[PDB]
Amino acid sequence: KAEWPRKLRSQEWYGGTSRDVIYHRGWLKNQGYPHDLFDGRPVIGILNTWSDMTPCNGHLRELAEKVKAGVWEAGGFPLEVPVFSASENTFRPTAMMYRNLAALAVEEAIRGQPMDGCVLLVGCDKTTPSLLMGAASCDLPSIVVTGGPMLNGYFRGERVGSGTHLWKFSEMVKAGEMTQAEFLEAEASMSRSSGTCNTMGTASTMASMAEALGMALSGNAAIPGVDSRRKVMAQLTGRRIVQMVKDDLKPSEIMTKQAFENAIRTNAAIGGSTNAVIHLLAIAGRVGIDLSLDDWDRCGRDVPTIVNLMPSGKYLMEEFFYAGGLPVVLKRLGEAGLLHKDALTVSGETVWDEVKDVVNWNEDVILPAEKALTSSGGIVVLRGNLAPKGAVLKPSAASPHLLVHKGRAVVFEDIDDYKAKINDDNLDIDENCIMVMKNCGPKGYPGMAEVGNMGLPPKVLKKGILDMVRISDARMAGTAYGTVVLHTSPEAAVGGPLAVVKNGDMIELDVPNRRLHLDISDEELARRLAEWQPNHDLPTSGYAFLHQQHVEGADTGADLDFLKGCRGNAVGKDSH
Amino acid sequence: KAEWPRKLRSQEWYGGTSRDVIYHRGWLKNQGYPHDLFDGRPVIGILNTWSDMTPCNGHLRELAEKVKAGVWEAGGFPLEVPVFSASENTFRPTAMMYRNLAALAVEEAIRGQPMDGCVLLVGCDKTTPSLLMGAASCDLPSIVVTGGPMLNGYFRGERVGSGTHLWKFSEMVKAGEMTQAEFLEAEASMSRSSGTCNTMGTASTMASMAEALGMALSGNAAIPGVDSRRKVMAQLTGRRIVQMVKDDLKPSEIMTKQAFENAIRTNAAIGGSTNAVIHLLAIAGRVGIDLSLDDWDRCGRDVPTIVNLMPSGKYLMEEFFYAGGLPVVLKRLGEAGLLHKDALTVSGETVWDEVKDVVNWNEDVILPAEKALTSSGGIVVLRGNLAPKGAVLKPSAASPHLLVHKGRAVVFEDIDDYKAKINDDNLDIDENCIMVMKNCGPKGYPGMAEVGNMGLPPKVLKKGILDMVRISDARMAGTAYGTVVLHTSPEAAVGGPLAVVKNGDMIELDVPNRRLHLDISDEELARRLAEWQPNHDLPTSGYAFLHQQHVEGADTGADLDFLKGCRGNAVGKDSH
Amino acid sequence: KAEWPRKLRSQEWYGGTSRDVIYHRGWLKNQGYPHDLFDGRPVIGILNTWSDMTPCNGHLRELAEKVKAGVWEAGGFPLEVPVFSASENTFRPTAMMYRNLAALAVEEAIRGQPMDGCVLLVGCDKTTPSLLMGAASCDLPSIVVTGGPMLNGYFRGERVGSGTHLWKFSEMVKAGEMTQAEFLEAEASMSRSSGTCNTMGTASTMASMAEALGMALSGNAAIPGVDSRRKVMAQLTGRRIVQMVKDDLKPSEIMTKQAFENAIRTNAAIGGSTNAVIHLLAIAGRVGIDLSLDDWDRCGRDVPTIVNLMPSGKYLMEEFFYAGGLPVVLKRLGEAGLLHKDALTVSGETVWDEVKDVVNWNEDVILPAEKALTSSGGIVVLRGNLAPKGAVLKPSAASPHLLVHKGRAVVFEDIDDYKAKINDDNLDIDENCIMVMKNCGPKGYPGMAEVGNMGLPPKVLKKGILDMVRISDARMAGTAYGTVVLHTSPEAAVGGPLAVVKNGDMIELDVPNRRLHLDISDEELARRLAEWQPNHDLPTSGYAFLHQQHVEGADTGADLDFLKGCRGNAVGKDSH
């Protein structure tokens, strides 16, 4: 470890008696700080994604105060810094488009200001990855505090998740099976405490990825946003980041290729969102680890999903927490040759040393190896002429008889074409057809929306059929079922083969052999591709234009090309 | 109703251009208020019992902000006013001693300052009664906001209440049946969100009493302190109190003898704390309603306890809430000739009009009339030479074979004598003995502590016996079982017959006939009483002295004598 | 000093593993505190008089957060506790009546809860004395944080104080010499930042008394409530109180008879409010120091008033601060044999060691000894048959030719009689008359209002006469001029000789000889006194009744009799 005492980067702002420093120090003193706070003790930036418009993060200012208390206790100097908050439930066209913008803004807010370490206060879907991406591109000691999930929803005395019962309550408000005064009580019971989606959606998955990567204190992922112990862990986190600054325990020493592999296997074990694939690839591209879609494939194999939570299962995050949460799961991976046991965490201990003594307190929700939901619930990476740079599928959430399936393509040229055609009873489609949607990726939608879980055509569900093969260049909510191929790359909008799929074309899906094949000749594919031109709207100005010019494919994390890698934390030139 | 517009009492401070008013108005303007806020619109005092030392009320400042928003929306002028917070879990000798002091301080803070209406932000045990007592002695329009109970505690995957498992975890930390690192996780799971005790203890009972008296919006009692809908109800409350000021909807028009009777029957139906007896008698003595121990007896009869919650039952407040909470219970009392249906509430509607359409969503926790826990779970008032001014007992929590019981007295001269003798194996006591404790009432303890649920002597539980008859002048937690006689009045310390009970004396308890008899001659009782002198310590100064001089007996609510009644809201003389 | 480590009184609540302690500790943990905060480190109660209805204290919650940060830094456990806030600008009949009630409530909030030390967050007039009174009756280590004065008011480009220009702007709104839109800008400029009255009124005087008694860090009195350095001093105060708990630096070791004498001389040097006499006598009666009106007389002599501030002078608190504030003044008293130099302060250093090196930066506001306003600007204590227990007068604010004056009495039987008669042109009064007002003391007004600075009769000011001798049993604002005799004791309402003064009686005022004489025979005084009966209204219930029964005279500080003295900090009996 590094020498303590030493001159930290904040002392470039706050150390000495040159005119430069009495400007910086004397200005900050107008908020009323004792002079010894500028003596070179660690200055801790608390990066807070709280916003009134990101209700998933509604309690994060209370957590900031707990962090602050911990920094004070440990003799640091805490400064809260709000950062761009990309909420999935408010941002249009899709929060995924603004993740890279939050990451840019976080990076520059870190490097450009006198902070020595970082607490990443996160919660809603895209906050966790964008803060880790921006923090990783600076490589100052950083630690994640997770907001935590909402409590269980109870409407009429039954367990309702968040986003699950969106179908029944909209179907019933129009089909007259409930009042409007009945419907307002129903909505008020789905999201009834501060916090994130309480299924194994993107928020729960990314909190789990943060803890499994070792970037948060052990136990961080599953505490309800509203439990006392979430405040406790916030204050302990504030104590810890001061020591981490002294020791210079940097993210590049935590997010090693072995830690990413631990996260991949944890994603399998928890049945986590397919969004974690895109985000971990993006975070690794900031740290500078070589991580690929193929790493997701090889490390995901033969890891049973063990947590019995919707969508894949029965319970919600509350129960996952009361059973011991993510540590119990990490133990089991360690008891099976799947965990890299000696991976360093932010506590200074190894992941195995943190988890090895925890007890599973409800085997109904953290299942024994025998009663697991799937024996290989990792994500699979399909390749072929239709996805030359790769596509992903969650086999746990699929239908056995459709894992190997060939069928004829019904094509939707974009999201509007899909909504026009799907419910139309004139559409030529049966259950062996393969639904194919284009122009839904990063550049195409724009922003790669969660439209990949296309709803089946009404004339197909009338037969009592619940699943069909669907392919697109889009994403999918962590909450989903069905045999869905996602993140098809290159996306249609950049001229990938998926752009030139026509109705009637034969498509073969072969998951056991990781194959996804468009059954046309190489000549016909070549001539269809040479004829291609970008049919979607091209922005001419604004951030939309920037994203259109610079976003990459979901196969490498869908980052902006000029933002890949780590640019360090060197202090910039002085402003006077 | 009253005339609106009109000159409200705040305009004595803030209306006109006399020097008196530009002092008052001009000073308050240093916090930055537009001038039209002083135009005579309702000035709403938000009386907040939040404190860092009353963790039951930990989230009340967040609720104050929701109330404030509602007052703003409705065109009032909101001003937060902290008031004395008597927390049962911090205050020694007992929070009951400071309830009257909080009520005094609340009363004077209302009458002495320019507020036209009151929001009573309450939660922990004694806050609800002391704020209602002080507000009732002013009779300005007032409305109660309840903090709400803590979530269910889960330690190892089983439901633990608050205060229930205090026995097992202390027994096991010393008997070595769990680590110290195991014990710290256990404690951190008993009280794991902001709020009050989540059984049918004094806090849940007094929240229910407030709603049943109609002094809070319907649905107020059972929302977890931490549920979104508790904030919603806070904001609606802030809107409503502005209209109530305009209409002059005063507490004296809500807390009618019929409303108190509705509360008494609700206490029976919910199996509520015996503390509600003392508090409702105290609140009624401020409003000026004639309510007596006998009213508790007659109105409590033949009301089954229907809510299946500890101590009397199986579940906790969370489940009571998800089933529909107190409105469901008030409906059932209305569907049975037990409710005064036309009693006015603070909403402007009648109690029956508020509840009549609500649905019971879990009959396991709000039981049908057939499966009720007791068919007459009201409280009973015992009288006799031993309690000439009355004593109370909760028959639901008693043992059938001990409802009628005569036995010989084992006397404990005070609380110290009890702890010295109870575990001593030399003590002459069997299970037919009647345990009798003195000097535990208002003047005696001092403050009437919750020591009435005396623990049995170890040599008696060795036989597998769980209950004995106990008598004292003390109180009991809302959480309790056993055949216990409470609030024996006059207390021992003021020379009531309980003072002169000696070991070996025959005592008869006869609940069906409301009898509690000390079997000695009237001559022997007279000569024992003439010999009496006050053996406990007499304070010479401080608040303890004031309480010693002026507190009355638990039979009339244990208020201070010079604080009984309503002194109105007349503006006092001007300070210059 | 005392042993550190040791078991502090909070460990009676939070130390061990008995059931008693897991109740207390486990409950407080619902706000989310790490377990080691209960390890016996100092628990610091931050007693906060903030209220939306005490605008003088409007920024005190921000200061509480600065204190909290300091307690955290020093390894204590900070808990904010709101206390009763007696604001002079809102409370009717007068905040003086509620000072003893705030002191009672503060005392019991300290002794009854698990705090080891106290930060007294104060500001508006009566907050400082009531918190010191309550804290002194417990004698736990305590330290004062002062809110600070408002900035200078500027209306039209001239310096206006707070309360000074109340005459001109009310005279002009009715005499048409300004618009109503002009008048609203004028009021908005008198009180234009958060803080207390910015003259040498009661708030500035009591802040100065706290610093001179050594109960606040040096420099505490004069920082504008709104200056950055007031937040700095709050945080330093939070650091310091943790050490003070460890060292057991108690108020009884700071408020020695020598410290009170230092305050008396400081009051003279600053030309402080006559209210400080009543409050210091009250505080000393809690500590148990023998301090008397005579101590005020002897120690006040020959101390020139040096601070050039209204009412006695030209500038306001802002300028007093920029010149060095109270330390500069304490130095000068030390450079003149007037200071007890070795008096201990809360910093651990002596008062002289704190101040001895400070520099006077504006001798226009802290005057040299030559240019002083008065050479003996202490307060004088008059005695005689008319004030047998004493009366006070500020000679600086008097008229030289009226210091020795005999005249005939014009009597006002109470405050209502005065307002009825004073402006009536039929009243038999010239400038040699001595105006005498009764029934304005503690029991009489009730509450001893600031009505002693009676306005002269219009027919007297028409001659260009600005001063007349006035006598009453009332108080006076810190802001005042004129030859006024105050705090006449015993007050009229308790049968003091002032009760039986009749029109035409000769009264002699002789300040140089400390004499105030009612020129009637001892026989006529005796028979007038035997005929006396209490003509004012007697309260029958409520706090008014309590005050009527128990308040004493202004000659001993006007405390409640049963609240005099120190009752210690012994932990009370356990509540279960």
Ligand code: FES
């Ligand atoms: S919307 Fe924020 S967690 Fe799903």
Ligand code: FES
């Ligand atoms: S201690 Fe506050 S609710 Fe029981």
Ligand code: FES
């Ligand atoms: S009114 Fe609060 S300082 Fe004068």
Ligand SMILES: [Mg+2]
């Ligand atoms: Mg999402």
Ligand SMILES: [Mg+2]
């Ligand atoms: Mg209780």
Ligand SMILES: [Mg+2]
């Ligand atoms: Mg004053």
